[PDB]
Design a protein around this nucleic acid. Structure first.
Lengths: 262, 153
RNA sequence: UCUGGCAUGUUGGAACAAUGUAGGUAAGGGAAGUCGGCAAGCCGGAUCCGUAACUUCGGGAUAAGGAUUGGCUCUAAGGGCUGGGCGGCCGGCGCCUAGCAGCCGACUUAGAACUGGUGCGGACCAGGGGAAUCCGACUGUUUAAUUAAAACAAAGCAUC
RNA sequence: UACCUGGUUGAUCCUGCCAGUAGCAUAUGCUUGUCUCAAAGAUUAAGCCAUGCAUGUCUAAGUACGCACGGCCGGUACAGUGAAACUGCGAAUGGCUCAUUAAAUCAGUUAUGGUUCCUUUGGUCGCUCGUACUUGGAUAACUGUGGUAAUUCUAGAGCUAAUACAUGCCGACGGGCGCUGACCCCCCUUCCCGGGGGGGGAUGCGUGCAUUUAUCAGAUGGUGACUCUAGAUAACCUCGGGCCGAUCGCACGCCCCCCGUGGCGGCGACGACCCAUUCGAACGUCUGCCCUAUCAACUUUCGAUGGUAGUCGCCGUGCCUACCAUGGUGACCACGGGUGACGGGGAAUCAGGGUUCGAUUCCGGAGAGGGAGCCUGAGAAACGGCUACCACAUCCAAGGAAGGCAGCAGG
RNA sequence: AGCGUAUAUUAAAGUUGCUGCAGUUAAAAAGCUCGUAGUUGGAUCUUGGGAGCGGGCGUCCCCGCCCUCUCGGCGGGGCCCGAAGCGUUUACUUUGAAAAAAUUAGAGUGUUCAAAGCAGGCCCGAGCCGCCUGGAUACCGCAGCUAGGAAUAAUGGAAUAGGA
RNA sequence: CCCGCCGGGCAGCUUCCGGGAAACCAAAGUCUUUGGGUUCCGGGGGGAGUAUGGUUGCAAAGCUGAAACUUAAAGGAAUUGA
RNA sequence: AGAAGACGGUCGAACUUGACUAUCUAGAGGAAGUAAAAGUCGCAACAAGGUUUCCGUAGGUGAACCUGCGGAAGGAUCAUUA
């Protein structure tokens, strides 16, 4: 290759992207932004494939320059903008607000939230550097660099940021006993409480997380995402509390629901 | 014993060997400041590395080197070089069809800092991956271990 | 070129025709000449590389093929002698020991910079080469005065 | 569904292979009523291509005096519909083929603390102390002229302009700091009169980020360790010059207070000096390939193995240069060659173990007849860019021009 | 609405034999010895004993039990073991972490069955100004990350004591 | 000299140990109820121990050693006759 | 500001020569291996095949073949008598 590839294929789409195989040889390539494309979602896929508001990619472009779609309080015309983790898309015409988070199946699900909840958010820091004129700054996973942070904030902490203000409201450190959600790997989409953590000087660290149902698991540091303090998340959660149930258990509830409905 | 054998005298960039002097005495009485720094993983800087008078840009302790990527080991066979010891590591590859293995070895060259002096033939040396400082050598010696040694007659 | 020797080899003067004897050069071809490359020409020294078939394993071999070569200014290496705590010496008091100091000396080799109209083994000296066939094994000898050869001899083999 | 039979015989037990026998891919042959999917020039020929096409593009928001239209209406001064062109951006993606390539590409894991990056986003853009209520020029289309056989051919004149090029201002903020510091004020020893200490301070040089440097403190931050991100001490800061708006639209408003026109104003777009993120980009650590000894001792005077000092290289190295004692590799298969070999994710078959096939539409690499080369661009050593050579060959008015369909059809 | 021939290849073929061959006479042991790669290399170092926790730790089958040294770290009494180590280092076994898409094993999905497709199913006086769900798992050889296991395979400790 | 015992042997002879296709053999056994270690060596019959390359030899020749092509049998043991 | 143009520095397409190496190819003539309808000598091996046979070496020969030195049983003889 002579440079940056400018296309994505139908099979080149990430697996958790629910895209059909027999519709086209290409895919809506997510363009550059605050998120790595491998764990983001374009606006077309969020609306056309999931919400069914539009049926063609052209119609998704029609509503975009109609300027009815907003992200983080900002109207973006990019149909392939990377709506990544902790992104809220609010449509004022229908008066609906959605918080983009993972479900129990490791999927970029759509979760309706109240407007008051959408006004604030949650972000995770990545690094601290003393930039210009000897003052600190924070660079996050959302690429929202913040000037003049609280000095008590360290690496791998979670900072609340408002849509309009764009500042630090409430920060929480990284510690045991805190609720967390996995942001990668096999355990993607699970909510649990950090019971243990082990370190390795020269490689990744392992954080052992044990959920409310006792299903313990282990995860890498880069896939740890802190949301709430203790055993209560700061934000609403989708169906299932982010608990991965087994194949046999899931089919048992599925058959019970089918029998009760019928 | 002269530190100045090369075409141009090598200088440690961090230290300042050049200092002013006071009345009734000189700075030459005290030894020059030496810049060194220990590493993690229990890689405690050995005695000869601190108190030695050698200067090396490529040493694990008095240089720019950061050891990362992978931590490995090997044995000592030959030492005919300028600050390089050739090492070889055994490893057994598995063949599925015949449900057995083959003995294999891929020897490499490691650059050894002059601080280590007590290395003989047939002992283990622990080395770690580093920057491509040479065309072939990409490892640096971090630890020296004997193998039925400590008594040579 | 010096020591020593000589007077150009049994004559001189003038001219510079043909033909000749001896020595050279020649555009473009490059053996088309001729019985035949006869004659002439090419190569040629030294240093550094690189050398085939075949073979009696010794050779063939300077095989073949290629590069360098001047002048000037430097650098490095290659040795000999003496000594070891006014004049001596009875002496512990010294310790030459990674061979140190002083003095002496000739011939080369290698490397580098600079430099000339790329010219330099500058004259002199000084192998053209390769692929094959025939004969004789080789070195040697022979018809002084037309035949130097495949002829003769030769070691080896055999016979009487 | 873990399978035989026939075949040496005067007949039988064995060894042993083939013949039949079951699937599997390419085509051939005879026939073929329907529909749902769907492979389809790779095999010898990565051989050559006539012809047609495959990259273009404008919002209220850069530039609009085109006699192509057109509203108000000729007292105004910038309407708009808009060819074409300048300006910025894409053309290095896509798609075809496997010629080439054998620890090499690639497959699993890791790093770039060893580097860079228009693109989207998040910061910053009064941080520096020294004509502005808008600067100079030509160049477009266009008109008027011309050349041949010519093109995606074009010089000379009058014009016009850009978010194109070059230069550049006031504001912006009153001051601090380190030195150099005249001068001025105060305190104490001193029986004397000299010193010992505090302060103001005019007048002078510097005093931001980006970059190059040399020095200091670092029980500001964090990593396990960077010579890290920070703070200062003294200079340069490239005229083949860095940053501090000479840019364009929308709806239009508030104040005359010390004033009949001055200030205050929002929504955006345009590229930045530097930092971060992402798409990425390339060089890297451990582990893995087919046949081959009728390839056994090989690399190294020409860089091969390493050190020191330099050169470029986006950065780290025999990438290159010079000096240093020889070193490295090899029967655990090197060096060499062949391959009817791009690799792998993967395909046929089946007790199990396994044997074969991998261009294919997927993820990476290479190529555009061949290997050379290069300007713009962030990213090319690019071929639907150019140059030269080699075969082939298009037009020629014989003075030249113009070329690569292993892109889609078709030959 | 197919079949044969032609050729490539697999099973057959225990006819390449690791699984899983043969060598007196059917093909075959070198004439023999040495010797290095390489291959394979004997036992031997904590086994039992009443632990009580559960059934038919009693005999027997599945669980931790009567590893250090430093602030007994949420200027000094038991309600503590977070981290600076390892009475040593490999191989193997299990889990866990690392797994670009498709295919394959296979969950559910109908209605022309399936091959295929990830879709569709669900009350309707229709104001029903439409609720819910799927789009999972398994394997991913080898190489490396990690936490245990400590039979099996080799390694050293201290013999002139340069011993803890 | 005779009687034995013990360990290392060259060995018969009988024997339904056993295996083997049998001839015959305590190894030519412990072999599908398949694994003690390992070397050399065979893969239907010919072509062919040939061609070519390499190496040894004074020669004759030795060691290493193919391919093209061609064949449905060549073979071992045993049965009764001649 | 600068077009045309010249000198020096680097790969270098391409060219010449030489060396090494791989593969594919002609060739007068020579000598083998493949099938044969079954053409000419007597008969080497199958019996003790009448000179058991086969193996190597050496040597010779129209040919099978003959000869010597050894070496075996695929020659008719597990035996040959104190």
């Amino acid at each position: 290759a002579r440079g940056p590839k400018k296309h994505l294929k139908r099979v080149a789409a990430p697996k958790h992207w629910m895209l059909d195989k027999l519709t086209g040889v290409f895919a809506p390539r997510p363009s550059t932004g605050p998120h790595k494309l491998r764990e983001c979602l374009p606006l077309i896929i969020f609306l056309r494939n999931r919400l069914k508001y539009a049926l063609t990619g052209d119609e998704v472009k029609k509503i975009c320059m109609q300027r009815f779609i907003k992200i983080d309080g900002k109207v973006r015309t990019d149909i392939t903008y990377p709506a990544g983790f902790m992104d809220v898309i609010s449509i004022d015409k229908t008066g609906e607000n959605f918080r983009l988070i993972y479900d129990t199946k490791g999927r970029f699900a759509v979760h309706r939230i109240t407007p008051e909840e959408a006004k604030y958010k949650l972000c995770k820091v990545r690094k601290i550097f003393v930039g210009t004129k000897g003052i600190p700054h924070l660079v996050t996973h959302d690429a929202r660099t913040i000037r003049y942070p609280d000095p008590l904030i360290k690496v791998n902490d979670t900072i609340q940021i408002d849509l309009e203000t764009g500042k630090i409201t409430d920060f929480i450190k990284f510690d045991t006993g805190n609720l967390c959600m996995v942001t990668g790997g096999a355990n993607l989409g699970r909510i649990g409480v950090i019971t243990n953590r082990e370190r390795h000087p020269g490689s990744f660290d392992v954080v052992h997380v044990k959920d409310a149902n006792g299903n313990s698991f282990a995860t890498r540091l880069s896939n740890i995402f802190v949301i709430g303090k203790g055993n209560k998340p700061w934000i609403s959660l989708p169906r299932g509390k982010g608990i991965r149930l087994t194949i046999a258990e899931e089919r048992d509830k599925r058959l019970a629901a089918k029998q009760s409905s019928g | 014993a002269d530190i100045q054998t090369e075409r141009a005298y090598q200088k440690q960039p961090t230290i300042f060997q050049n200092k002013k002097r006071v009345l009734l005495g000189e700075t030459g009485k005290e030894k020059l400041p030496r810049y060194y720094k220990n590493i993690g993983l229990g890689f405690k800087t050995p005695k000869e590395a601190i108190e030695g008078t050698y200067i090396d840009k490529k040493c694990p302790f008095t240089g720019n080197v950061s050891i990362r990527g992978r931590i490995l080991s090997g044995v000592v066979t030959k030492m005919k070089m300028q600050r390089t010891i050739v090492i070889r590591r055994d490893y057994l590859h598995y063949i599925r069809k015949y449900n057995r293995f083959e003995k294999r070895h891929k020897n490499m060259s490691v650059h050894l800092s002059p601080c280590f002096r007590d290395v003989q033939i047939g002992d283990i040396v622990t080395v770690g991956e580093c920057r491509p400082l040479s065309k072939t050598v990409r490892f640096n010696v971090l630890k020296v271990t004997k193998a039925a040694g400590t008594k040579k007659q």
